[PDB]
Each structure stands twice: as structure tokens, then as C-alpha cells.
């Protein structure tokens, strides 16, 4: 799912004729490295974004019915003493969330974040400068080294005509 | 704890606390027999089916069978698909000891009360660290 | 339940006999002031018809039955659809009739110029 | 008693439109529900005691109409919401006749 | 923010008011329900000008209601917020929350987060006011206020005010 | 007597003419649900009963059962069945900790009316207590009957 | 307008459409033994000149689908050599006021 | 007329100059034609609107200081309007305390005086309104004066304006 891992459905026939269609597991590694780009950037971006979010002042939640309450309509709900804001459905005085007061520690969160992903950045400044080649099945076998004398996997692959995907 | 989310028809001139309420089901009015005054109107007096939660608990499943154009083979792997639940097991073991209550129970010509109960005696003992280690036939026996 | 051997015929019913056999512009554009064609040039019939009359009779009945003023004279008439049909019968309504041409286009008509030919 | 659909054919046939109405509306199911003009949808939030009005997704709070339908077709809008077919509902015409 | 707009009401005349002076009765219902009416999409509506020539057509009668529907189309000025904007003010109320200010017809609330730090709450006071090593937010004190965020419902508005901003404040 | 409708003697109505008995019995029976959801034959009390139907109780003895005998007019209460319900709720505002028992009784049909002619108490084939009511009128000839 | 014996060969139908304004028309001989237009069934199709289409249009505030169609296979259509989108006045006796004039458009 | 939905817009920001789709420059009046988006300043507004009242006071008889002029208006208030006027009546106050300029020509004048400047109608309405003493606290007050007016033309406006104001 995260496709640090790509899958092969070849089948082979093995001498003692009792093949099954095995899958072999293997490494894409453009894909694998663009994944992981996306993944770090997304993660960045919504630390981020909830960073403004919480930038945005505190707002107020009711605790009897658990609901948030924003700024903009705690004015459209306070009291005719111009003193509290009340619920809509418990009538409650509302109390005041953290949405500001954790905006330091999202921040310091996004600093502890930053400098540990630092290797993973430098590496991807380090690929950036380069030229990877697309590997793939075919490729990941020239470097191949075999695990098990007695592996029911047939490494060589057979190419087949007619599969037009 | 949580939201009320309560109505409560109290008429609004009587005033009286607890209000003196009348529900007129043939004419679909809720009124206030003080006053006279109706409170809810258009009330609300078959379409799924029976289910009791205290036998079975809030369990909400349908089976898979043959219409009037079936294919056998699609229904096969529907089944196989249904049987390979996990969040059920509970609750499929459940309902085979259930399934063996009443089939001791029939076997017995005992009437559905005894069934009943016998059921519901096998349901709060179910799940006991203290009733862990005893036999499936000891359990049905004693629930019997 | 019921068991009855007088036949009724279930009306509305007849998906039974459905599932048996299931196999076998110019002139105007928009909302302008165009709209309305005047009055000079209006050519629907100047006599106002059945539907036209029950309506009107019932929109000025409906009014005088929410104390509407009544600009006829009263001869001890109570029921609001009598005296709608007498202020009809004398031309004293005050409403028009907005007769709606298939194109959008429409025609006003009071009902104090239409002919109660009926 | 059932007003079916043939005697619905017959008051067509009388040109009686506003008993045939009352019968569908003030006889049977008169439901009040409120859509936006942005989304044809009855997907609004409606706090009358408040006089707030809102339809999440458009974001709009001065949009809003309120219609008068049978409750039988409410079902059966929201029926074809689980469809997975909106069936929009526009206070507007959008081409000429 | 104060403007002058051309606007259309549908008005609903009940079948009372259909004597031989029926404009003077729908002018009048114009006014009631206008006058200091707060639609969200216009701003509050203050007086309607230009009252001697109004735009009132051939009003529909509802089919089953029996009131008369007219589209009165007419020319009125209004006052209607904006985020960003800087409006001048009297404060009117105050809490810890905040205090509210009167701008124009309508009441802007100036929250505890949007105070310079050096104003603080003194409930002891009478009235309660905001005290500060320089100045003091007190009621029916001019206050120069900036509104950074509103919200408009069908017949409410509401914005919130700051004056945390340099040249902001009392006045 | 036009278009298939006739003409029919009052004089010989009033004696015995096509006058007829018509008797309708009532099924009710007390259930276990489980251990304290069950069902009890009893006269039920609008201080502890919840949704009492608006006709009256009074005809009911203390089994719950109406004595044979007993002339009944329309949603008269015949069979008076209570179950249990879940304490400390709020539910039309009319609730309170007193009603531990909803009603679950068995009301006469609206537009019958007539004398109980039989109550017959017993038990069913799972030995709950059962119960029938059967309740007769008379039908007297009149417009609209069909002949 | 061609007039041919029994058949053409369905490879000269791809060269039937030919440069504008030219049309070409293929009647069968067996198909024309017998004028149609002279039964009984069939009233008199006049064709509708362009001007004479728009007052149509104009008079009865029409557009061209609300009018009533005339397929560009019927056997009339072919005999008028009709092209689509002309309009023919068709009148016919009527038993309740004696002529009747209806318009049908060539789609 | 298309049905999109076109839900997506930025947020009315004064700012930015978006007051949203029915505040534009054009508007179109009930005669039909576009026309300028009127946009008074607080002065104008109330002579405007006075102007509105002695109006409605003169058709219904046919058919300075503060201090002076707030009774003088509220007795105009109650003669002239009827219920709801609690709104009217808080912005009437709100002219009278927040009232740069006095009588008609006064303002007439500031705004042939703002007229020279070609300006967006929405900001020289906000500098009618405004008693900004410096160009920098009128730029940071109404961000739309950013890069829209020169320094010393700003500098002598306001200072004219300051010698405008009376009273
Ligand atoms: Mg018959
Ligand atoms: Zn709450
Ligand atoms: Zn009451
Ligand atoms: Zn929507
Ligand atoms: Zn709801």
C-alpha cells in the first residue's frame, strides 16, 4: 500500500510439475522513492495546515452536549446580560477550547519533526542531483542473490504473447 | 451526561406542572385536557422484522439464498465469503449454542418458555472467567 | 384478517396485469417587460371561461371569508360564494386574469372587461 | 379512503387543480421542508426557534427556501438520495418554454 | 459599511387591506418590516428613500392562501458589515469575555484574545471596564475599532472586532 | 325499492324478523419475554401504568377480566394486560418513578358495543395463562343491510 | 430523380449523396405503379415555403420539435421530395368542420 | 443563464476590495441602466438620510450643535417614523456623534474634493470617515491606499481635511 514493496504474479513449472502461481517481492525504486516524497510532503503540509488551524483563536465547545463552538457564533449566542455565551440546545455557559494555547507545542511538534526527517530530506536532495533508473522485474534479477538451495521459485522469467495491458 | 434531546407536552397557558395530557389516537391529536388546547397533532399510531435485543443482542445480519433466478455458483462464494467473518465469531458460536438449546429443548417437547429461559440462562452466563474451563455439555445441561 | 367471497375489484391495481406482460425564442427571450402582450393586441377570447369563473368565484369567496371589503350592497347575503357570485354579476371584482400562452407569453385580462358569457 | 390515482384522473378531467392539491396536500401528508438555492438538495439545517439557517457544503446561510411537499415525496427524494441520484429542487426556471 | 441600494421585498397583503387605498396599506407594511430590518445578504436595512414614487406592480394572489404577493422593488440605505474593515464606536456592554460596541445600528463584540495584553479586566470597577497602563475601555467610551470577522444569518449579524493593531483603540 | 334496494316491514322487524345474534371473541395472552419482562392480567392503575388507553377500567375486575354479563359500549377495556418497563425515564413529560408498568390491555372494537357472554380463562400449550372474551350484540335489521 | 427496374447495388449508395445543392432520389418502378397521393386515406401535402414556415412558427409561437413530425422515409415525404426541416400544410376533410389544416415538419 | 453551482469565491474583504457580487462597482438601478456603487461616508450619511426624514415630514404635513441637533432629530424620528426605529434611532446617535462635517455644502464639497482623486468610491468613503491624522495611519488603516495614492497627495488630503472638519 505504501509501495515500498512491489509484487510479481509469475508462475513457473517446475520439474516435479506441481507449480503454484507464487508471488515474487521485490523493490520499484523510483516509485518507492516518489511515494515516500509524497508521504513526507503530505505529512508536512497537514502538520502545517493544522498549525493555521490552531493559529485561529480558541472558540469555546459546550461540555454538555460536546459540541465545538467558533467565535464567529458565540456572539450570535450570548446572554442578554452581554456576559456568557450560551448553548443552543443545553443552555449552558460555554467554556473555552485550546485552539491557540497548543499552537506553540504544534509548532515546537513540527521543529522535533523536522531535524529527525533531515537524513531523509538530504537523501532526496542527494537523488534529486542524480538520475535514477526505473527498475523492474527484470531489472531487480541482475543483482539477485538466492536465499534457499531448495527455492520452489524459479527466478527465470518467461516473457508470454498475446498481453496487451 | 450528553445532550437531553427530550420533548415534553406541557400546554403552554395552563401552565401546570406535571400537565394533565390526553392522547386522542382516533383523531391523531395530542390536547391538553384542561384546556382543551392540542399540543402535538398528526401522531404517528409489518414493513422489517421481529428482533429482540436481549436474546441476541443488537445483532442486525441477513442470510444469502436462492431467488427466482439464482446462479448457484455466485451464491457458493457468497456463503464462503459470509462464513469467513471475524468480528462474528462470538456471536456465531453464540448462536450455535443457542441452535443446540433449541434443538435439546425440541428433542424434549419442552415448551418455548423453557427455551426462553434457557437462552437467556446460557446468554448472562456467557463470557465468564469463572464458567471457562467446563464442558459444552455441562453448560447446556445446567442451562436446560 | 377477512375471508370474503364478494368480489371487490382492487382498484388502482393494474401492475398485475403490467408485470403479465413486461415485454414487447422569436418574439420573446427571458423575463423582459416583452413578456406581456399589451392590451391592444390581445388575442385570446374575450369571455371568461368555466375554469376562470370557479376560480375567480372562489379567490374573491376566500377573501370575503378573511373580511375582505365587499364593494357590493349586501342584500342579507351571509354565504362568501354568493357574494362573489353577486359581485361578479355586477363587475365589481378587482382581479385580472393572467392567461398563460404555451411560449411563456401572457395575456392580462380584468375580470371587470371579460364577458360572464356562462 | 384511498384518493387513487384514477380518481386523481377524474379531477384532472373536472379541471378542479386546487381541490386535486388539497386532496395530495391539506387531505393526506402537508410537509414543510427547506432546500438552497445553490444545491437542490433538502440537506438544510433548519433552528427556526434561533432563525438560523445552513446547508453544509455550500456554506450558504441566506440561500435558503422553504417548500411545501408531500411527505410521501420527501421519501421519496431522500429514497433516491440513497441512490445515489439527486433529485435538486429549483425555486427557478432555467430555459424558456 | 453604509450604502445606498436598490432592493425588492415580496410583501404579503392579507385580504383586510384590499380597500380602494391599497398602496398607502403596502407602503406602510414596507415600512414595519423594513425599517431597521436585518437581512444578512443586504446588512441592516435603515429607511427606505425615495417614498413618494415606489415600484409596486400587479401583485399575485396565492392560490390557496388568498393574500395578495407583491414585489415591491424600492431604493433604501443600509448598513452592511465587512471583514477588514475599520468603523468607529461606543462601547455599550462590558465582560470578561470581551465588550460589545455599537456600530451604527448593530453591536460588534471585541473578544478577551483581541486586547493588547496590557488591558485587563477589572470587574471591581463601576461599570466594569478594561484597564491599561495608558488608557482605559469603559462604556459609552469612542472607541476606533476594526472588524476582521463576521457572520450573516437569513435576519442576524454578527461580527467580531480587535484593536490589537497600531492606531486602533479608544479614540 | 329502486335498483336492486327493497322495502322491508318495521312493524315485523320489531317482531323478530331477520334479527340476529352476533358474537365476537377476544384473544389475549400474558408472555414471557424474559425473566422480569413479563406479561400480567390486572386492573391497571393511572397512578403506576404508563399509556393508559382513554376508555375506561372500571368494568374490569381484579384478574383483569371483565364478568360475563356485562354490557360494554365502544373502547371499552375487556382484557386488562400490564408489562414492565425500564425505571427513570422521560417520556410525554407524564412520566414519572411510579409507573413501573406500561399498559398493554385489550380494548373493545370502536364502533361495537354489546354484553360479554363468556370469559374463559386458561392456559396455552407453553403454559402461559390465556385468555377469550367473547361479546354479543344483536343486529337488528335496518337501512342498508344486505338481503 | 432515378427510376430503376428491381434493386442498385449497395455500393452505389455510398455515391447517392452527392455535392450540394445536388440531390438524387432512387424510386423503385414497382413502388410508383399506383399514384398514392390519389387514395382516398391520403389528403393533399402542400409544401411550406420558407417565409410561409416562419409566419407558422411566428403565428402559433412554435419552435421547430413542437410542431408535428413527419419521418423522411414516409411515402408522401418521398413523392414531395421532402428535405428536413420543410413543413407541409396538410388538409384533410374533417367530419365535425369540413377542412382541417395541419402542419407536419420533416425530420 | 447557466445552473453551475459556483459555489467557490474568496470572502468579502474590505482590503482586498470584495464586498461580494451584490456590492460590485456597476449596479444596476430599477430604470435598468449600471450605475456607480454608492457608498456614503458618515457625514453624507446622515444629511441623506435627514434630508429622507424632512422629506417624509413634509408629505406627511401635505397629505449647529450636537446637542441641539440630536433632540431636533428625534423629534423628527418620532414624527416621521413609525414602530422599529430602535435601529434607526442607534444610528441616528451614531451620525450625530460620529459627524466629520455639519451641514450639506461641507460635504458636497469633500466629496468634489474626492472626486479629484478617481479613487475606488468604497475607500474616499472610509476617508470621509475616518479622522486619519497621517498617510501611513490611513494606509494601515485601509489597506486599499497601498500602492493607490502618492504620499504627499494623501498627506495633503488629510490635512485638508482636517482643516474641512468643524466643530
Ligand atoms: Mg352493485
Ligand atoms: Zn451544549
Ligand atoms: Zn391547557
Ligand atoms: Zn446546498
Ligand atoms: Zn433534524
Given at each position: 500500500?505504501?509501495?515500498?514493496?512491489?509484487?510479481?504474479?509469475?508462475?513457473?513449472?517446475?520439474?516435479?510439475?506441481?507449480?503454484?502461481?507464487?508471488?515474487?517481492?521485490?523493490?520499484?525504486?523510483?516509485?518507492?522513492?516518489?511515494?515516500?516524497?509524497?508521504?513526507?510532503?503530505?505529512?508536512?503540509?497537514?502538520?502545517?495546515?493544522?498549525?493555521?488551524?490552531?493559529?485561529?483563536?480558541?472558540?469555546?465547545?459546550?461540555?454538555?452536549?460536546?459540541?465545538?463552538?467558533?467565535?464567529?457564533?458565540?456572539?450570535?449566542?450570548?446572554?442578554?446580560?452581554?456576559?456568557?455565551?450560551?448553548?443552543?440546545?443545553?443552555?449552558?455557559?460555554?467554556?473555552?477550547?485550546?485552539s491557540g494555547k497548543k499552537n506553540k507545542e504544534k509548532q515546537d511538534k513540527l521543529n522535533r519533526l523536522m531535524d529527525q526527517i533531515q537524513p531523509i530530506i538530504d537523501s532526496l536532495k542527494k537523488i534529486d542531483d542524480s538520475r535514477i533508473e526505473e527498475n523492474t522485474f527484470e531489472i531487480a534479477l541482475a543483482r539477485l542473490i538466492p536465499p534457499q538451495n531448495q527455492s520452489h521459485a524459479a527466478y527465470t522469467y518467461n516473457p508470454k504473447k498475446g498481453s496487451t495491458m | 451526561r450528553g445532550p437531553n434531546l427530550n420533548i415534553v407536552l406541557t400546554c403552554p397557558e395552563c401552565k401546570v406542572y406535571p400537565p394533565k395530557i390526553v392522547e386522542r389516537f382516533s383523531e391523531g391529536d395530542v390536547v391538553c385536557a384542561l384546556c382543551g388546547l392540542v399540543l402535538s397533532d398528526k401522531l404517528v399510531d409489518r414493513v422489517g422484522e421481529a428482533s429482540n435485543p436481549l436474546l441476541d443482542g443488537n445483532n442486525l445480519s441477513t442470510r444469502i439464498g436462492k431467488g427466482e433466478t439464482t446462479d448457484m455458483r455466485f451464491t457458493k462464494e457468497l456463503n464462503k465469503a459470509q462464513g469467513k467473518n471475524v468480528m462474528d465469531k462470538k456471536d456465531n458460536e453464540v448462536q450455535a449454542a443457542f441452535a443446540?438449546?433449541?434443538?435439546?429443548?425440541?428433542?424434549?417437547?419442552?415448551?418455548?418458555?423453557?427455551?426462553?429461559?434457557?437462552?437467556?440462562?446460557?446468554?448472562?452466563?456467557?463470557?465468564?472467567?469463572?464458567?471457562?474451563?467446563?464442558?459444552?455439555?455441562?453448560?447446556?445441561?445446567?442451562?436446560? | 384478517?377477512?375471508?370474503?367471497?364478494?368480489?371487490?375489484?382492487?382498484?388502482?391495481?393494474?401492475?398485475?396485469?403490467?408485470?403479465?406482460?413486461?415485454?414487447?425564442?422569436?418574439?420573446?427571450?427571458?423575463?423582459?417587460?416583452?413578456?406581456?402582450?399589451?392590451?391592444?393586441?390581445?388575442?385570446?377570447?374575450?369571455?371568461?371561461?368555466?375554469?376562470?369563473?370557479?376560480?375567480?368565484?372562489?379567490?374573491?369567496?376566500?377573501?370575503?371569508?378573511?373580511?375582505?371589503?365587499?364593494?357590493?350592497?349586501?342584500?342579507?347575503?351571509?354565504?362568501?360564494?354568493?357574494?362573489?357570485?353577486?359581485?361578479?354579476?355586477?363587475?365589481?371584482?378587482?382581479?385580472?386574469?393572467?392567461?398563460?400562452?404555451?411560449?411563456?407569453?401572457?395575456?392580462?385580462?380584468?375580470?371587470?372587461?371579460?364577458?360572464?358569457?356562462? | 379512503?384511498?384518493?387513487?390515482?384514477?380518481?386523481?384522473?377524474?379531477?384532472?378531467?373536472?379541471?378542479?387543480?386546487?381541490?386535486?392539491?388539497?386532496?395530495?396536500?391539506?387531505?393526506?401528508?402537508?410537509?414543510?421542508?427547506?432546500?438552497?438555492?445553490?444545491?437542490?438538495?433538502?440537506?438544510?439545517?433548519?433552528?427556526?426557534?434561533?432563525?438560523?439557517?445552513?446547508?453544509?457544503?455550500?456554506?450558504?446561510?441566506?440561500?435558503?427556501?422553504?417548500?411545501?411537499?408531500?411527505?410521501?415525496?420527501?421519501?421519496?427524494?431522500?429514497?433516491?438520495?440513497?441512490?445515489?441520484?439527486?433529485?435538486?429542487?429549483?425555486?427557478?426556471?432555467?430555459?424558456?418554454? | 459599511?453604509?450604502?445606498?441600494?436598490?432592493?425588492?421585498?415580496?410583501?404579503?397583503?392579507?385580504?383586510?387591506?384590499?380597500?380602494?387605498?391599497?398602496?398607502?396599506?403596502?407602503?406602510?407594511?414596507?415600512?414595519?418590516?423594513?425599517?431597521?430590518?436585518?437581512?444578512?445578504?443586504?446588512?441592516?436595512?435603515?429607511?427606505?428613500?425615495?417614498?413618494?414614487?415606489?415600484?409596486?406592480?400587479?401583485?399575485?394572489?396565492?392560490?390557496?392562501?388568498?393574500?395578495?404577493?407583491f414585489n415591491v422593488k424600492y431604493r433604501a440605505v443600509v448598513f452592511k458589515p465587512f471583514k477588514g474593515e475599520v468603523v468607529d464606536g461606543t462601547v455599550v456592554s462590558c465582560s470578561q469575555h470581551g465588550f460589545e460596541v455599537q456600530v451604527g445600528p448593530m453591536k460588534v463584540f471585541v473578544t478577551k484574545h483581541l486586547m493588547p495584553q496590557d488591558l485587563t479586566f477589572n470587574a471591581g470597577s463601576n461599570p466594569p471596564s478594561y484597564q491599561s497602563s495608558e488608557d482605559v475601555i469603559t462604556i459609552k467610551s469612542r472607541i476606533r475599532v476594526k472588524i476582521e470577522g463576521c457572520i450573516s444569518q437569513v435576519s442576524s449579524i454578527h461580527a467580531i472586532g480587535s484593536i490589537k493593531e497600531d492606531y486602533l483603540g479608544a479614540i | 325499492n329502486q335498483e336492486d334496494s327493497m322495502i322491508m316491514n318495521q312493524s315485523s322487524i320489531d317482531r323478530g324478523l331477520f334479527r340476529s345474534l352476533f358474537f365476537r371473541s377476544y384473544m389475549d395472552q400474558e408472555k414471557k419475554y424474559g425473566m422480569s419482562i413479563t406479561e400480567t392480567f390486572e386492573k391497571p392503575q393511572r397512578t403506576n401504568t404508563l399509556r393508559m388507553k382513554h376508555g375506561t377500567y372500571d368494568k374490569l375486575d381484579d384478574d383483569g377480566?371483565?364478568?360475563?354479563?356485562?354490557?360494554?359500549?365502544?373502547?371499552?377495556?375487556?382484557?386488562?394486560?400490564?408489562?414492565?418497563?425500564?425505571?427513570?425515564?422521560?417520556?410525554?413529560?407524564?412520566?414519572?418513578?411510579?409507573?413501573?408498568?406500561?399498559?398493554?390491555?385489550?380494548?373493545?372494537?370502536?364502533?361495537?358495543?354489546?354484553?360479554?357472554?363468556?370469559?374463559?380463562?386458561?392456559?396455552?400449550?407453553?403454559?402461559?395463562?390465556?385468555?377469550?372474551?367473547?361479546?354479543?350484540?344483536?343486529?337488528?335489521?335496518?337501512?342498508?343491510?344486505?338481503? | 430523380?432515378?427510376?430503376?427496374?428491381?434493386?442498385?447495388?449497395?455500393?452505389?449508395?455510398?455515391?447517392?449523396?452527392?455535392?450540394?445543392?445536388?440531390?438524387?432520389?432512387?424510386?423503385?418502378?414497382?413502388?410508383?405503379?399506383?399514384?398514392?397521393?390519389?387514395?382516398?386515406?391520403?389528403?393533399?401535402?402542400?409544401?411550406?415555403?420558407?417565409?410561409?414556415?416562419?409566419?407558422?412558427?411566428?403565428?402559433?409561437?412554435?419552435?421547430?420539435?413542437?410542431?408535428?413530425?413527419?419521418?423522411?422515409?414516409?411515402?408522401?415525404?418521398?413523392?414531395?421530395?421532402?428535405?428536413?426541416?420543410?413543413?407541409?400544410?396538410?388538409?384533410?376533410?374533417?367530419?365535425?368542420?369540413?377542412?382541417?389544416?395541419?402542419?407536419?415538419?420533416?425530420? | 443563464?447557466?445552473?453551475?453551482?459556483?459555489?467557490?469565491?474568496?470572502?468579502?474583504?474590505?482590503?482586498?476590495?470584495?464586498?461580494?457580487?451584490?456590492?460590485?462597482?456597476?449596479?444596476?438601478?430599477?430604470?435598468?441602466?449600471?450605475?456607480?456603487?454608492?457608498?456614503?461616508?458618515?457625514?453624507?450619511?446622515?444629511?441623506?438620510?435627514?434630508?429622507?426624514?424632512?422629506?417624509?415630514?413634509?408629505?406627511?404635513?401635505?397629505?449647529?450643535?450636537?446637542?441641539?441637533?440630536?433632540?431636533?432629530?428625534?423629534?423628527?424620528?418620532?414624527?416621521?417614523?413609525?414602530?422599529?426605529?430602535?435601529?434607526?434611532?442607534?444610528?441616528?446617535?451614531?451620525?450625530?456623534?460620529?459627524?466629520?462635517?455639519?451641514?450639506?455644502?461641507?460635504?458636497?464639497?469633500?466629496?468634489?474634493?474626492?472626486?479629484?482623486?478617481?479613487?475606488?468610491?468604497?475607500?474616499?468613503?472610509?476617508?470621509?470617515?475616518?479622522?486619519?491624522?497621517?498617510?501611513?495611519?490611513?494606509?494601515?488603516?485601509?489597506?486599499?491606499?497601498?500602492?493607490?495614492?502618492?504620499?504627499?497627495?494623501?498627506?495633503?488630503?488629510?490635512?485638508?481635511?482636517?482643516?474641512?472638519?468643524?466643530?
Open positions: 500500500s505504501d509501495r515500498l514493496i512491489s509484487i510479481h504474479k509469475q508462475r513457473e513449472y517446475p520439474p516435479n510439475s506441481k507449480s503454484v502461481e507464487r508471488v515474487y517481492y521485490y523493490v520499484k525504486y523510483p516509485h518507492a522513492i516518489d511515494a515516500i516524497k509524497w508521504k513526507v510532503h503530505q505529512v508536512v503540509q497537514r502538520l502545517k495546515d493544522d498549525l493555521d488551524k490552531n493559529s485561529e483563536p480558541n472558540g469555546y465547545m459546550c461540555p454538555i452536549c460536546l459540541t465545538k463552538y467558533t467565535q464567529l457564533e458565540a456572539v450570535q449566542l450570548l446572554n442578554f446580560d452581554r456576559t456568557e455565551f450560551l448553548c443552543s440546545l443545553c443552555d449552558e455557559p460555554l467554556v473555552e477550547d485550546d | 443446540k438449546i433449541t434443538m435439546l429443548c425440541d428433542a424434549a417437547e419442552l415448551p418455548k418458555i423453557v427455551k426462553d429461559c434457557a437462552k437467556e440462562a446460557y446468554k448472562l452466563c456467557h463470557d465468564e472467567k469463572t464458567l471457562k474451563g467446563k464442558s459444552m455439555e455441562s453448560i447446556m445441561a445446567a442451562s436446560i | 384478517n377477512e375471508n370474503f367471497e364478494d368480489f371487490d375489484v382492487e382498484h388502482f391495481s393494474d401492475e398485475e396485469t403490467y408485470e403479465e406482460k413486461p415485454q414487447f425564442e422569436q418574439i420573446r427571450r427571458k423575463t423582459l417587460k416583452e413578456k406581456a402582450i399589451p392590451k391592444d393586441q390581445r388575442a385570446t377570447t374575450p369571455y371568461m371561461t368555466k375554469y376562470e369563473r370557479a376560480r375567480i368565484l372562489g379567490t374573491r369567496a376566500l377573501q370575503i371569508s378573511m373580511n375582505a371589503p365587499v364593494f357590493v350592497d349586501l342584500e342579507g347575503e351571509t354565504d362568501p360564494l354568493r357574494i362573489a357570485m353577486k359581485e361578479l354579476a355586477e363587475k365589481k371584482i378587482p382581479l385580472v386574469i393572467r392567461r398563460y400562452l404555451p411560449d411563456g407569453s401572457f395575456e392580462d385580462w380584468s375580470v371587470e372587461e371579460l364577458i360572464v358569457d356562462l | 379512503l384511498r384518493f387513487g390515482e384514477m380518481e386523481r384522473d377524474c379531477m384532472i378531467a373536472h379541471g378542479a387543480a386546487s381541490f386535486l392539491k388539497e386532496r395530495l396536500m391539506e387531505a393526506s401528508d402537508a410537509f414543510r421542508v427547506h432546500i438552497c438555492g445553490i444545491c437542490g438538495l433538502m440537506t438544510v439545517i433548519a433552528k427556526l426557534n434561533h432563525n438560523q439557517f445552513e446547508c453544509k457544503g455550500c456554506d450558504n446561510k441566506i440561500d435558503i427556501y422553504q417548500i411545501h411537499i408531500p411527505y410521501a415525496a420527501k421519501l421519496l427524494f431522500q429514497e433516491l438520495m440513497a441512490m445515489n441520484i439527486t433529485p435538486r429542487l429549483y425555486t427557478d426556471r432555467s430555459r424558456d418554454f | 459599511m453604509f450604502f445606498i441600494k436598490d432592493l425588492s421585498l415580496n410583501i404579503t397583503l392579507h385580504p383586510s387591506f384590499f380597500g380602494p387605498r391599497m398602496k398607502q396599506y403596502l407602503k406602510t407594511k414596507l415600512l414595519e418590516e423594513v425599517e431597521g430590518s436585518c437581512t444578512g445578504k443586504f446588512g441592516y436595512i435603515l429607511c427606505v428613500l425615495d417614498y413618494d414614487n415606489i415600484d409596486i406592480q400587479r401583485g399575485r394572489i396565492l392560490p390557496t392562501d388568498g393574500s395578495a404577493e | 377480566l371483565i364478568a360475563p354479563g356485562v354490557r360494554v359500549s365502544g373502547e371499552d377495556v375487556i382484557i386488562g394486560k400490564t408489562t414492565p418497563i425500564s425505571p427513570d425515564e422521560e417520556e410525554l413529560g407524564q412520566r414519572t418513578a411510579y409507573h413501573s408498568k406500561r399498559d398493554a390491555s385489550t380494548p373493545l372494537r370502536s364502533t361495537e358495543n354489546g354484553i360479554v357472554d363468556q370469559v374463559l380463562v386458561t392456559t396455552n400449550q407453553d403454559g402461559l395463562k390465556f385468555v377469550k372474551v367473547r361479546v354479543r350484540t344483536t343486529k337488528i335489521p335496518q337501512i342498508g343491510d344486505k338481503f | 430523380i432515378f427510376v430503376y427496374q428491381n434493386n442498385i447495388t449497395p455500393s452505389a449508395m455510398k455515391l447517392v449523396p452527392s455535392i450540394p445543392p445536388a440531390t438524387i432520389e432512387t424510386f423503385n418502378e414497382a413502388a410508383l405503379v399506383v399514384n398514392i397521393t390519389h387514395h382516398e386515406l391520403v389528403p393533399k401535402h402542400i409544401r411550406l415555403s420558407s417565409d410561409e414556415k416562419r409566419e407558422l412558427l411566428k403565428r402559433y409561437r412554435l419552435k421547430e420539435s413542437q410542431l408535428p413530425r413527419i419521418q423522411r422515409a414516409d411515402p408522401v415525404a418521398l413523392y414531395l421530395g421532402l428535405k428536413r426541416g420543410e413543413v407541409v400544410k396538410i388538409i384533410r376533410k374533417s367530419e365535425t368542420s369540413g377542412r382541417y389544416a395541419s402542419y407536419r415538419i420533416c425530420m | 443563464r447557466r445552473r453551475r453551482l459556483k459555489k467557490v469565491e474568496e470572502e468579502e474583504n474590505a482590503a482586498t476590495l470584495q464586498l461580494g457580487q451584490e456590492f460590485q462597482l456597476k449596479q444596476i438601478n430599477h430604470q435598468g441602466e449600471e450605475e456607480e456603487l454608492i457608498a456614503l461616508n458618515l457625514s453624507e450619511a446622515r444629511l441623506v438620510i435627514k434630508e429622507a426624514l424632512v422629506e417624509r415630514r413634509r408629505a406627511f404635513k401635505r397629505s449647529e450643535t450636537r446637542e441641539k441637533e440630536l433632540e431636533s432629530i428625534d423629534v423628527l424620528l418620532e414624527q416621521t417614523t413609525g414602530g422599529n426605529n430602535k435601529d434607526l434611532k442607534n444610528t441616528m446617535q451614531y451620525l450625530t456623534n460620529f459627524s466629520r462635517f455639519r451641514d450639506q455644502e461641507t460635504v458636497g464639497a469633500v466629496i468634489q474634493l474626492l472626486k479629484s482623486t478617481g479613487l475606488h468610491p468604497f475607500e474616499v468613503a472610509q476617508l470621509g470617515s475616518l479622522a486619519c491624522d497621517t498617510a501611513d495611519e490611513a494606509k494601515t488603516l485601509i489597506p486599499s491606499l497601498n500602492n493607490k495614492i502618492s504620499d504627499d497627495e494623501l498627506e495633503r488630503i488629510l490635512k485638508e481635511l482636517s482643516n474641512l472638519e468643524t466643530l
